[PDB]
Design an enzyme around this catalytic site. Structure first.
Site, PDB file in Angstrom:
ATOM      1  N   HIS A 176       0.852  -1.163   0.000  1.00 13.57           N
ATOM      2  CA  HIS A 176       0.000   0.000   0.000  1.00 13.57           C
ATOM      3  C   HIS A 176       0.906   1.236   0.000  1.00 13.57           C
ATOM      4  O   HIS A 176       2.046   1.193   0.488  1.00 13.57           O
ATOM      5  CB  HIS A 176      -0.930  -0.095   1.189  1.00 13.57           C
ATOM      6  CG  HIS A 176      -1.594   1.183   1.541  1.00 13.57           C
ATOM      7  ND1 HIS A 176      -2.350   1.890   0.646  1.00 13.57           N
ATOM      8  CD2 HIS A 176      -1.645   1.869   2.702  1.00 13.57           C
ATOM      9  CE1 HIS A 176      -2.819   2.978   1.228  1.00 13.57           C
ATOM     10  NE2 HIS A 176      -2.417   2.977   2.483  1.00 13.57           N
ATOM     11  N   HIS A 222       0.896   4.756   1.204  1.00 16.09           N
ATOM     12  CA  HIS A 222       0.151   5.296   2.311  1.00 16.09           C
ATOM     13  C   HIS A 222      -0.078   6.758   2.120  1.00 16.09           C
ATOM     14  O   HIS A 222       0.880   7.512   2.052  1.00 16.09           O
ATOM     15  CB  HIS A 222       0.868   5.092   3.636  1.00 16.09           C
ATOM     16  CG  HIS A 222       0.057   5.544   4.779  1.00 16.09           C
ATOM     17  ND1 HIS A 222      -0.594   4.670   5.615  1.00 16.09           N
ATOM     18  CD2 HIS A 222      -0.260   6.788   5.209  1.00 16.09           C
ATOM     19  CE1 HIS A 222      -1.267   5.361   6.523  1.00 16.09           C
ATOM     20  NE2 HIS A 222      -1.088   6.649   6.292  1.00 16.09           N
ATOM     21  N   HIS A 248       4.350   0.393   2.594  1.00 17.18           N
ATOM     22  CA  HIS A 248       4.383  -0.732   3.525  1.00 17.18           C
ATOM     23  C   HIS A 248       3.436  -1.794   3.120  1.00 17.18           C
ATOM     24  O   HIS A 248       2.449  -1.497   2.416  1.00 17.18           O
ATOM     25  CB  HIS A 248       3.983  -0.312   4.920  1.00 17.18           C
ATOM     26  CG  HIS A 248       2.557   0.135   5.094  1.00 17.18           C
ATOM     27  ND1 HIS A 248       1.514  -0.746   5.213  1.00 17.18           N
ATOM     28  CD2 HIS A 248       2.033   1.367   5.326  1.00 17.18           C
ATOM     29  CE1 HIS A 248       0.398  -0.068   5.429  1.00 17.18           C
ATOM     30  NE2 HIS A 248       0.692   1.217   5.544  1.00 17.18           N
ATOM     31  N   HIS A 260       0.413  -4.344   3.201  1.00 25.86           N
ATOM     32  CA  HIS A 260      -0.937  -4.353   3.794  1.00 25.86           C
ATOM     33  C   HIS A 260      -1.496  -5.772   3.720  1.00 25.86           C
ATOM     34  O   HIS A 260      -2.694  -5.969   3.571  1.00 25.86           O
ATOM     35  CB  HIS A 260      -1.839  -3.385   3.038  1.00 25.86           C
ATOM     36  CG  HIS A 260      -2.681  -2.484   3.899  1.00 25.86           C
ATOM     37  ND1 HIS A 260      -3.727  -2.938   4.683  1.00 25.86           N
ATOM     38  CD2 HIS A 260      -2.677  -1.132   4.002  1.00 25.86           C
ATOM     39  CE1 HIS A 260      -4.276  -1.896   5.283  1.00 25.86           C
ATOM     40  NE2 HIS A 260      -3.686  -0.795   4.849  1.00 25.86           N
ATOM     41  N   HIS A 312      -5.936   4.056  19.935  1.00 24.61           N
ATOM     42  CA  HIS A 312      -5.918   3.363  18.616  1.00 24.61           C
ATOM     43  C   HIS A 312      -5.845   4.427  17.550  1.00 24.61           C
ATOM     44  O   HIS A 312      -6.679   5.320  17.570  1.00 24.61           O
ATOM     45  CB  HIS A 312      -7.194   2.553  18.437  1.00 24.61           C
ATOM     46  CG  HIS A 312      -7.387   1.528  19.502  1.00 24.61           C
ATOM     47  ND1 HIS A 312      -6.652   0.365  19.534  1.00 24.61           N
ATOM     48  CD2 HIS A 312      -8.201   1.495  20.586  1.00 24.61           C
ATOM     49  CE1 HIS A 312      -6.991  -0.336  20.602  1.00 24.61           C
ATOM     50  NE2 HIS A 312      -7.946   0.316  21.244  1.00 24.61           N
ATOM     51  N   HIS A 321      -7.089   5.077  10.563  1.00 28.95           N
ATOM     52  CA  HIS A 321      -6.635   5.584   9.270  1.00 28.95           C
ATOM     53  C   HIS A 321      -7.757   5.338   8.267  1.00 28.95           C
ATOM     54  O   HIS A 321      -8.369   4.293   8.285  1.00 28.95           O
ATOM     55  CB  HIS A 321      -5.338   4.848   8.852  1.00 28.95           C
ATOM     56  CG  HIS A 321      -4.929   5.073   7.425  1.00 28.95           C
ATOM     57  ND1 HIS A 321      -4.700   6.328   6.891  1.00 28.95           N
ATOM     58  CD2 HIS A 321      -4.683   4.198   6.429  1.00 28.95           C
ATOM     59  CE1 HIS A 321      -4.368   6.220   5.624  1.00 28.95           C
ATOM     60  NE2 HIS A 321      -4.333   4.938   5.327  1.00 28.95           N
ATOM     61  N   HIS A 360      -8.387   5.266   4.040  1.00 31.91           N
ATOM     62  CA  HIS A 360      -7.681   5.207   2.747  1.00 31.91           C
ATOM     63  C   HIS A 360      -8.348   6.128   1.805  1.00 31.91           C
ATOM     64  O   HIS A 360      -9.537   6.391   1.938  1.00 31.91           O
ATOM     65  CB  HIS A 360      -7.704   3.802   2.142  1.00 31.91           C
ATOM     66  CG  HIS A 360      -6.758   2.864   2.805  1.00 31.91           C
ATOM     67  ND1 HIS A 360      -5.785   2.173   2.114  1.00 31.91           N
ATOM     68  CD2 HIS A 360      -6.598   2.551   4.107  1.00 31.91           C
ATOM     69  CE1 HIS A 360      -5.077   1.455   2.967  1.00 31.91           C
ATOM     70  NE2 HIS A 360      -5.565   1.660   4.174  1.00 31.91           N
ATOM     71  N   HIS A 365      -9.334   1.549   9.432  1.00 30.20           N
ATOM     72  CA  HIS A 365      -8.913   0.671  10.454  1.00 30.20           C
ATOM     73  C   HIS A 365      -7.964   1.333  11.380  1.00 30.20           C
ATOM     74  O   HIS A 365      -7.430   2.405  11.092  1.00 30.20           O
ATOM     75  CB  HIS A 365      -8.236  -0.556   9.838  1.00 30.20           C
ATOM     76  CG  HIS A 365      -7.014  -0.235   9.027  1.00 30.20           C
ATOM     77  ND1 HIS A 365      -5.737  -0.299   9.537  1.00 30.20           N
ATOM     78  CD2 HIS A 365      -6.877   0.143   7.736  1.00 30.20           C
ATOM     79  CE1 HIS A 365      -4.869   0.023   8.597  1.00 30.20           C
ATOM     80  NE2 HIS A 365      -5.535   0.278   7.497  1.00 30.20           N
ATOM     81  N   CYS A 366      -7.791   0.669  12.515  1.00 29.19           N
ATOM     82  CA  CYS A 366      -6.700   0.943  13.442  1.00 29.19           C
ATOM     83  C   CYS A 366      -5.380   0.563  12.769  1.00 29.19           C
ATOM     84  O   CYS A 366      -5.241  -0.559  12.204  1.00 29.19           O
ATOM     85  CB  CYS A 366      -6.904   0.105  14.703  1.00 29.19           C
ATOM     86  SG  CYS A 366      -5.644   0.530  15.905  1.00 29.19           S
ATOM     87  N   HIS A 367      -4.416   1.482  12.797  1.00 27.35           N
ATOM     88  CA  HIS A 367      -3.151   1.255  12.151  1.00 27.35           C
ATOM     89  C   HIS A 367      -2.099   0.627  13.054  1.00 27.35           C
ATOM     90  O   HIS A 367      -0.937   0.485  12.637  1.00 27.35           O
ATOM     91  CB  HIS A 367      -2.665   2.544  11.548  1.00 27.35           C
ATOM     92  CG  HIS A 367      -1.889   2.352  10.288  1.00 27.35           C
ATOM     93  ND1 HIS A 367      -0.795   1.527  10.222  1.00 27.35           N
ATOM     94  CD2 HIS A 367      -2.073   2.850   9.050  1.00 27.35           C
ATOM     95  CE1 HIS A 367      -0.300   1.567   9.003  1.00 27.35           C
ATOM     96  NE2 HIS A 367      -1.045   2.387   8.271  1.00 27.35           N
ATOM     97  N   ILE A 368      -2.494   0.259  14.284  1.00 29.07           N
ATOM     98  CA  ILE A 368      -1.759  -0.754  15.043  1.00 29.07           C
ATOM     99  C   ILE A 368      -1.976  -2.102  14.348  1.00 29.07           C
ATOM    100  O   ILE A 368      -3.065  -2.681  14.426  1.00 29.07           O
ATOM    101  CB  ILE A 368      -2.187  -0.840  16.516  1.00 29.07           C
ATOM    102  CG1 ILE A 368      -1.733   0.415  17.285  1.00 29.07           C
ATOM    103  CG2 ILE A 368      -1.540  -2.071  17.155  1.00 29.07           C
ATOM    104  CD1 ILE A 368      -2.520   0.708  18.564  1.00 29.07           C
ATOM    105  N   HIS A 393      -3.775  -5.044  15.898  1.00 33.13           N
ATOM    106  CA  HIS A 393      -5.229  -4.829  16.007  1.00 33.13           C
ATOM    107  C   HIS A 393      -5.930  -5.015  14.635  1.00 33.13           C
ATOM    108  O   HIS A 393      -6.834  -5.844  14.502  1.00 33.13           O
ATOM    109  CB  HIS A 393      -5.533  -3.476  16.617  1.00 33.13           C
ATOM    110  CG  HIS A 393      -4.900  -3.277  17.956  1.00 33.13           C
ATOM    111  ND1 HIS A 393      -4.718  -2.033  18.508  1.00 33.13           N
ATOM    112  CD2 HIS A 393      -4.402  -4.161  18.854  1.00 33.13           C
ATOM    113  CE1 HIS A 393      -4.124  -2.148  19.685  1.00 33.13           C
ATOM    114  NE2 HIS A 393      -3.929  -3.433  19.923  1.00 33.13           N
ATOM    115  N   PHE A 448      -9.826  -5.374  13.450  1.00 40.43           N
ATOM    116  CA  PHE A 448     -10.260  -4.016  13.866  1.00 40.43           C
ATOM    117  C   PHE A 448     -10.368  -3.062  12.666  1.00 40.43           C
ATOM    118  O   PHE A 448      -9.631  -2.053  12.555  1.00 40.43           O
ATOM    119  CB  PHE A 448      -9.298  -3.445  14.944  1.00 40.43           C
ATOM    120  CG  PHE A 448      -9.925  -2.501  15.941  1.00 40.43           C
ATOM    121  CD1 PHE A 448     -11.303  -2.389  16.128  1.00 40.43           C
ATOM    122  CD2 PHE A 448      -9.097  -1.739  16.744  1.00 40.43           C
ATOM    123  CE1 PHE A 448     -11.826  -1.542  17.085  1.00 40.43           C
ATOM    124  CE2 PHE A 448      -9.609  -0.888  17.701  1.00 40.43           C
ATOM    125  CZ  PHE A 448     -10.977  -0.784  17.868  1.00 40.43           C
TER     126      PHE A 448
END
Ligand SMILES: *[C@@H]1O[C@H](CO)[C@@H](O[C@@H]2O[C@H](CO)[C@@H](O[C@H]3O[C@H](CO[C@H]4O[C@H](CO[C@H]5O[C@H](CO)[C@@H](O)[C@H](O)[C@@H]5O)[C@@H](O)[C@H](O)[C@@H]4O)[C@@H](O)[C@H](O)[C@@H]3O)[C@H](O)[C@H]2NC(C)=O)[C@H](O)[C@H]1NC(C)=O
Ligand SMILES: *[C@@H]1O[C@H](CO)[C@@H](O[C@@H]2O[C@H](CO)[C@@H](O[C@@H]3O[C@H](CO)[C@@H](O)[C@H](O)[C@@H]3O)[C@H](O)[C@H]2NC(C)=O)[C@H](O)[C@H]1NC(C)=O
Ligand SMILES: *[C@@H]1O[C@H](CO)[C@@H](O[C@@H]2O[C@H](CO)[C@@H](O[C@@H]3O[C@H](CO)[C@@H](O)[C@H](O)[C@@H]3O)[C@H](O)[C@H]2NC(C)=O)[C@H](O)[C@H]1NC(C)=O
Ligand SMILES: *[C@@H]1O[C@H](CO)[C@@H](O[C@@H]2O[C@H](CO)[C@@H](O)[C@H](O)[C@H]2NC(C)=O)[C@H](O)[C@H]1NC(C)=O
Ligand SMILES: *[C@@H]1O[C@H](CO)[C@@H](O[C@@H]2O[C@H](CO)[C@@H](O)[C@H](O)[C@H]2NC(C)=O)[C@H](O)[C@H]1NC(C)=O
Ligand SMILES: *[C@@H]1O[C@H](CO)[C@@H](O)[C@H](O)[C@H]1NC(C)=O
Ligand SMILES: [O-][O-]
Ligand SMILES: [O-][O-]
Ligand SMILES: [Cu+2]
Ligand SMILES: [Cu+2]
Ligand SMILES: [Cu+2]
Ligand SMILES: [Cu+2]
Ligand SMILES: [Cu+2]
Ligand SMILES: [Cu+2]
Ligand SMILES: [Cu+2]
Ligand SMILES: [Cu+2]
Ligand SMILES: [Cu+2]
Ligand SMILES: [Cu+2]
Ligand SMILES: [Cu+2]
Ligand SMILES: [Cu+2]
Lengths: 497, 497
Positions: B64, B66, B109, B111, B395, B398, B400, B450-453, B456, B461
C-alpha cells in the site's frame, strides 16, 4: 547469620554492589539481605521493622519466607492482599512461624509489588542435625551460601514495566556491569583438599542464570529444599526463586577459577568479568582468574533429579488422574497477563481476611475469576501449557505453602508419575512444553500461585488457590497485630505507600 | 531516493539493525525500504517483484502507498482482499498511479496481515516545485528524511498476538536494544547555520512515539501531507503511520545532541541509548551526546494544528450536521476487535472485485456488517468513541483514499467546525474522548478504515467504506495484471502463502 529469632530493620540506602551507586531497600544495612538461619524444628520469630522513607521504592512492605509451608500460619506467608495488608513505614510486625518438617536452602524477599528488585531479598538456610547428605562434604557454613541477584541501575517503579534484563549479575552481592568493569568481584575462598556444600540461591527478579565453575564439577544433593540422589553436573540453569545445594571437592591445583553466572538476557557473557565471581584457593595470588570456558559435558535436566528419599506422587499414573485437575491458559493483551481469561488485581481486603470474615465459596471471594477453591485430602494436578501469547517465557511458576511433584518438565514430553523430583519453583518452558505438577491439599489457607518473574506477577500473572476454606479459619489462628494491619494500611495517604 | 519509475524486489534476509540478527523482509536489500520520491504531478510506475522464501513471514504480499488518494486507481491501493488479491512469490506486479493533486511526506508498507511488522515498510516523499513553505528552509533531501520504526527480536507470526511493545526503536534504520547497548546509532548530520526540512515518518506497527531533539525546537510545517500554519514545539507525540515535516534551525553550538523517540510501551526510556539517535553538527566529535532533556514547555496538541490553505469542513457546524453520519462502537472478545458487532474477516473475493461484478449494495458485499456503502458527493461524519472495551488505546485509525477533517481531537471536548487540521491518521484517544472526522465522498471505490496498530487490524479491527458503488467500475478501470492476481493466488498450496 542471624536467626532463628531476629530483628530485621528495613531502611533506604545508597549502595554500590557493581561499583555504581543508587538508592535501594536494605535490610539491617545490606543488600542482599542478611543470611537468616535455624535448624529443622525451630520456631522463627522475625520482627520486621519498617523504617523506609522512599515512596518511589515503596514505604510500605511485606515479607515472604519462600519455600516454607506455614501450616496453621497462613497469615505470616507474606503476599500482599492475599495473606496480609502491607506493614506501614515507622511500624513493626512480628512474623512468628515454625518449620517442623522441612530443611535445606530457602530465601526471603518482599512480596509487595516489585519491591524485591530494589533490594529486599536474601538467603535463608535451615540446617538439619540428621542431614542424610551430611557425610558427602566437610564444610557448610555462612561462606558456602552463594546468592544470585539481577541488578538494575534504574529502580523498579522508574524503569520499564518489563525490564529487559539486568545491568549486572551479583554473586554474593558483587559483580560488574559493562560500565563498571573494574568493580570488585566476589571471592569465594576454599582450601585444597576439602569438600564444600555450596548453597546456590536465585534472588532473581527476572532472568534465569546458567551457573558453571571453570575447571570443576558440581554434585547436586538438594533442590528447592528437597534432597536428591546425588547428581554430578558441570552447568546448572537456575530460574528465579530456585535453589540447589551442590558439593564441590576443592581438589584442583591452587589457583583462581572463574565462577560464571550468565543470564538468559540483559548484559550477557563475561567480557570485562561481568557476570563473574572468583573461586580462590587459599594461597593463590589475589588476581583475576585466567581460566577459560568449556562446552559443558553434562548439564542439568530436572528429568535427571530424583528425590533422595522415596516420595509418592499423588493420584493415579495417568494424566488427569486426580480429584481436581486444572489447566492454566496463559494470555496477554499487550500489557496484562491472564490466566484462564483473568488478570490478577489485588483485592482491597486480603483473601485470608475474606475467608476469616466468612466468605468461602469461589463466587463470594474477590477478585472473582482469579481465586480457585479446592477440596481437602484431595490430589490436585495443574498444567501450565506454554504459549507464544505469554511473552517472557520461560516463566518460573511457583506455588506457596506447598512443594509439588514435577510429573513433566520442560524439554521432556515423557510424563513421570514414578520418581519425579519435587519442588516449589518450576520452569514452564516454551511452546511445545506442557509442564505439569501434582500435590495433595495438606494445608488449609489461600496460597498464591504466580510467575516468579516479579514483573509478570506485577502485571497480574497469578492466581490464588484457596484450599479448605471451611476448615481454614479454625486452622489458621490469627494473632492481634495481624488484624491491625488493614486498619493501619487503609489509614494512610497514597503518598506514604 | 528512487522513483518515480523503479523496481522493488522483496526478499528475505538477516538484518542486525540494533546489532541483534534476525531474518526479515527487505526491499532492494534494505529494511526500512528505500526512499521512494518524485514530484507533484508525477506518475509512479512501481514494479513489485516478489522473491520471498519464508512462509512464516509470508511468501505473498500487497504493498500500500500510504496517504495517496489513488483517484481512479483504486486497484493499486494495496489492502489485501479489499483492493487486490496478494501477489504470489516468483511473480511481479505493476502499481501504476499518479499524484496530480498532492505533495509532502508519505510512506509505503505491506498491507497483508502483520507482514510490515517484519520489515516491509519505508518512506516515500513527493516534493512540490512550488512548495508554499520552501522559503522557511535551506536543505531538504534524502538525508532529511527521519523514519521511526518499532523493531522486534521475534517475528510477527512467531511472537504473541499482542506483543509487549518494541524491543528497540529504529531511527533511520539504526537503534539499540537493552542488551545490545553498544550497537551503532543513527547519526543525522547538520551544518551550523543551516535550516532543514526534517520529514518525520512513523513506520510503527504499534506504539506511538514521543519525539524530541535536545536543545532544539521544531516548526511543524506539514502534517500527514497537508501543509500547515508554522507551529514551533519542542516535543511531538507521533502516532503509528502519521508524518510531520518540521524545520530545525541548526543554530546551536557545534555538538552532539540526543534525538529521542520514546515508545508508548515496550523497552521504554533511554537507558544505554535505547530509543535514540544523534544529531551531529559537522565538526563535533564522533561520540555520544551528553545532552539531557527537559520537560517540554510546548509539546504539540493536534488542536493547535491548522491548514496553511483554508480547507472547508463538509456539512453544517453541529454534530450530525452532514449527509451521512456514522459511529463505530468498539469491542474486543479477548482475541478479536469488533466494530459494530462485526470483526473484519477478509473475503475470498476482494471487495473491489466484488463491486466490479456489480455488487453495489450493502446486502450483497462480503464481509457483511463490515462493508459500509457511501452515497457519492455527500458529506460524511464518523465518530470513534474510545472505550475500555477496546484495549490497546490510543488506537490510531486511518482512512484510505482521503484526507479528512479532525472536527474533534483526543483530549478535547471542543468541536472545531471552522479551521481544524486535515490528515489521514488520528489518535482516537482514551475513554472519555469521542474523536470525530469528516470528508466528502469525491473518490469512487472501497477504502479501508482501520486501526493502524497492525496487530489490532490483524485481529479484525477494520471496516471498508465502499463509496459510489455504481460509478466504481467506470472510474477505476483495471489492467490485466490485476485481473490475473486472484486466479494466481487461488492456485497456491497453503505452504506457499
Ligand atoms: C449488536 O448487538 C445487537 C444484535 O444482537 C444489537 O442490539 C439491537 O439494537 C437495536 C437498535 O435499534 C435494538 O432495537 C430496538 O430497541 C431500541 C431500544 O432498546 C434499548 O432498550 C432496551 C431495553 O432497555 C431497558 O430495559 C433493560 C432490560 O430489559 C434495562 O437493562 C435498561 O436499563 C432499560 O431500562 C435494551 O435492551 C437495548 O439494549 C437498548 O438499550 C428501540 O429504540 C428501537 O426502536 C428498537 O425497537 C434492539 O433491541 C437490539 N437487539 C438485540 C437483539 O438486543 C445492536 O444494534 C448491535 N450493534 C450494532 C452497532 O449494530
Ligand atoms: C528514592 O528512590 C528513587 C529510586 O531508587 C531515587 O531515584 C533516583 O532519582 C534521581 C533523580 O531523579 C536519578 O538520577 C538521575 O539520573 C540521570 C541519568 O539517567 C542523570 O542525568 C541525573 O543527573 C540523575 O543522576 C536516579 O537515577 C534515581 N535512582 C534510581 C535507582 O532510579 C531517589 O533519588 C530516591 N530519593 C532520595 C531522596 O534518595
Ligand atoms: C524464517 O523466518 C522466521 C521468522 O523470522 C525465522 O524464525 C527463527 O527461528 C529460529 C529457530 O528456528 C529462532 O531461534 C531460536 O530461538 C530460541 C528461543 O525460543 C533459542 O533456543 C535459539 O535462539 C533458537 O535459535 C528465531 O527466534 C526465529 N526468528 C525470528 C526473527 O523470530 C526462520 O529462521 C526463517 N527461516 C529461514 C529459512 O531462515
Ligand atoms: C496441556 O494439558 C492439558 C490437560 O493436561 C490440556 O488441557 C485440556 O484441554 C481440553 C481442550 O479440549 C479441555 O477440554 C480439557 O479440560 C483440558 N484437560 C484438563 C485435564 O483440564 C491442554 O490441551 C494441553 N496443552 C498443550 C498445549 O499441550
Ligand atoms: C460520539 O458522538 C456521536 C455523534 O457525533 C454519538 O452518536 C449518537 O448517539 C445518539 C444517542 O446515543 C444517537 O441518537 C445518534 O443516532 C448517534 N449518532 C450516530 C451517528 O451514531 C455517539 O453516541 C457518541 N459517543 C460517545 C461515547 O460519546
Ligand atoms: C476467554 O474468553 C473467551 C470469550 O469470552 C472464551 O471463549 C474463552 O474460553 C475464555 N477462556 C477461558 C475461559 O479459558
Ligand atoms: O515467593 O513468592
Ligand atoms: O496503512 O493502511
Ligand atoms: Cu540516601
Ligand atoms: Cu519467592
Ligand atoms: Cu513462595
Ligand atoms: Cu568492595
Ligand atoms: Cu513470567
Ligand atoms: Cu509468591
Ligand atoms: Cu537466510
Ligand atoms: Cu499505512
Ligand atoms: Cu493508507
Ligand atoms: Cu552500522
Ligand atoms: Cu488499535
Ligand atoms: Cu490501511
Amino acid at each position: 547469620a542471624i536467626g532463628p529469632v531476629a530483628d530485621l530493620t528495613l531502611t533506604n540506602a545508597a549502595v554500590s554492589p557493581d561499583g555504581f551507586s543508587r538508592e535501594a531497600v536494605v535490610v539491617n544495612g545490606v543488600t542482599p539481605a542478611p543470611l537468616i538461619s535455624g535448624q529443622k524444628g525451630d520456631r522463627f520469630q522475625l520482627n520486621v521493622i519498617d523504617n523506609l522513607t522512599n515512596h518511589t521504592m515503596l514505604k510500605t512492605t511485606s515479607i515472604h519466607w519462600h519455600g516454607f509451608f506455614q501450616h496453621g500460619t497462613n497469615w505470616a506467608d507474606g503476599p500482599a492482599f492475599v495473606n496480609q495488608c502491607p506493614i506501614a513505614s515507622g511500624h513493626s510486625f512480628l512474623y512468628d512461624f515454625q518449620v517442623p518438617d522441612q530443611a535445606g536452602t530457602f530465601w526471603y524477599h518482599s512480596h509487595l509489588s516489585t519491591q524485591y528488585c530494589d533490594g529486599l531479598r536474601g538467603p535463608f538456610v535451615v540446617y538439619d542435625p540428621n542431614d542424610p547428605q551430611a557425610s558427602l562434604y566437610d564444610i557448610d557454613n555462612d561462606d558456602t551460601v552463594i546468592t544470585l541477584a539481577d541488578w538494575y541501575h534504574v529502580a523498579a517503579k522508574l524503569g520499564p514495566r518489563f525490564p529487559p534484563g539486568s545491568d549486572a549479575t551479583l554473586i554474593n552481592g558483587l559483580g560488574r556491569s559493562p560500565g563498571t568493569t573494574a568493580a570488585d568481584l566476589a571471592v569465594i575462598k576454599v582450601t585444597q583438599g576439602k569438600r564444600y556444600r555450596f548453597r546456590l540461591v536465585s534472588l532473581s527478579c527476572d532472568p534465569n542464570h546458567t551457573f558453571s565453575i571453570d575447571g570443576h564439577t558440581m554434585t547436586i544433593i538438594e533442590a528447592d529444599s528437597v534432597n536428591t540422589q546425588p547428581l554430578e553436573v558441570d552447568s546448572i540453569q537456575i530460574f528465579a526463586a530456585q535453589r540447589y545445594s551442590f558439593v564441590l571437592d576443592a581438589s584442583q591445583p591452587v589457583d583462581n577459577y572463574w565462577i560464571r553466572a550468565n543470564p538468559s538476557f540483559g548484559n550477557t557473557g563475561f567480557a570485562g568479568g561481568i557476570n563473574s565471581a572468583i573461586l580462590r584457593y587459599l594461597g593463590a595470588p589475589e588476581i583475576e582468574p585466567t581460566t577459560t570456558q568449556t562446552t559443558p559435558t553434562k548439564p542439568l535436566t530436572e528429568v535427571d533429579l530424583h528425590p533422595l528419599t522415596p516420595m509418592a506422587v499423588p493420584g493415579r499414573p495417568e494424566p488427569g488422574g486426580v480429584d481436581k485437575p486444572l489447566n492454566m491458559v496463559f494470555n496477554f493483551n499487550g500489557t496484562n497477563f491472564f490466566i484462564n481469561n483473568h488478570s490478577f488485581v489485588p483485592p482491597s481486603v486480603p483473601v485470608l481476611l475474606q475467608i476469616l470474615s466468612g466468605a468461602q465459596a469461589a463466587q463470594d471471594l474477590v477478585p472473582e475469576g482469579s481465586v480457585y477453591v479446592l477440596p481437602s485430602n484431595s490430589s490436585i494436578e495443574i498444567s501450565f501449557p506454554a504459549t507464544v501469547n505469554a511473552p517472557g517465557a520461560p516463566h518460573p511458576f511457583h506455588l506457596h505453602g506447598h512443594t509439588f511433584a514435577v510429573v513433566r518438565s520442560a524439554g521432556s514430553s515423557e510424563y513421570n508419575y514414578d520418581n519425579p523430583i519435587f519442588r516449589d519453583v518450576v520452569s514452564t518452558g516454551t511452546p511445545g512444553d506442557n509442564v505439569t505438577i501434582r500435590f495433595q491439599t495438606a494445608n488449609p489457607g489461600p496460597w498464591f500461585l504466580h510467575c516468579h518473574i516479579d514483573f509478570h506477577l506485577d502485571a497480574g500473572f497469578a492466581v490464588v488457590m484457596a484450599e479448605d476454606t471451611p476448615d481454614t479459619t479454625a486452622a489458621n489462628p490469627v494473632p492481634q497485630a495481624w488484624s491491625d494491619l488493614c486498619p493501619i494500611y487503609d489509614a494512610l495517604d497514597p503518598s506514604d505507600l
